[PDB]
A paper describes a structure:
[name] is 380 amino acids in length and contains a bipartite nuclear localization signal (NLS), a Src homology 3 (SH3) and a sterile alpha motif (SAM) domain, which makes [name] a prototypical adaptor protein. In the current report, we show that the SAM domain of [name] self-associates to form a distinct dimer with an affinity much stronger than reported previously for homodimerization of other SAM domains. Structure determination reveals that this SAM domain forms a novel type of dimer interface that is incompatible with homooligomerization.
In parallel, we determined the crystal structure of SAMwt to a resolution of 2.05 Å. No electron density was visible for T318–E321 in the weighted 2Fo-Fc map, most likely because of conformational flexibility at the termini. The 3D-structure adopts the typical five helix bundle of a SAM domain with the following secondary structure elements: α1 (L257–R263), α3 (L281–F284), α4 (E289–E294) and α5 (P300–Y316). The highest dissociation free energy was obtained for a crystallographic dimer with 2-fold crystallographic symmetry in which helices α5 and α5′ point in the same direction and are located in close proximity to each other. A free energy gain of 4.7 kcal mol−1 and a buried surface area of ~870 Å2 upon SAMwt symmetric dimer formation were obtained. Hydrogen bonds and salt bridges between amino acids in helices α1 and α5′ and between P300 and Q301 at the N-terminus of helices α5 and α5′, respectively, stabilize the dimer interface.
Author numbering:
A (entry chain A), B (entry chain A): 253 to 317
The structure:
């Protein structure tokens, strides 16, 4: 599957948040596995669609590595 | 990661759609990889949140097997 945070984001079409995530501790897929909702609140990532895609991706990333 | 369609759905919290999906050709994770939006339209799965979770999961399932 996608090998970089950027590649992951591109795949679910949310590369617009790449620069946000990396400036606040989300640089690798390994970091991205640790994402949860209140961080999205803090990052002002408030679109419920974006948020559902992001958290679903993180959960499945943790599950299937 | 989750090994059954039902386990996957449970994980992203959408087990309510299990019975829908299986009655229309989505019985395994292998089948679920083939999901796309217009099938959700046909299955009257119209919540945009549910739909984003479902399709994100399917895309990532295809990508990381």
């Amino acid at each position: 599957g996608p090998k970089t945070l950027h590649e992951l984001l591109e795949r679910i079409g949310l590369e617009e948040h790449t620069s946000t995530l990396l400036l606040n501790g989300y640089q690798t897929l390994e970091d991205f596995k640790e994402l949860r909702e209140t961080h999205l609140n803090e990052l002002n990532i408030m679109d419920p669609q974006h948020r559902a895609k992001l958290l679903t991706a993180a959960e499945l990333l943790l599950d299937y590595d």
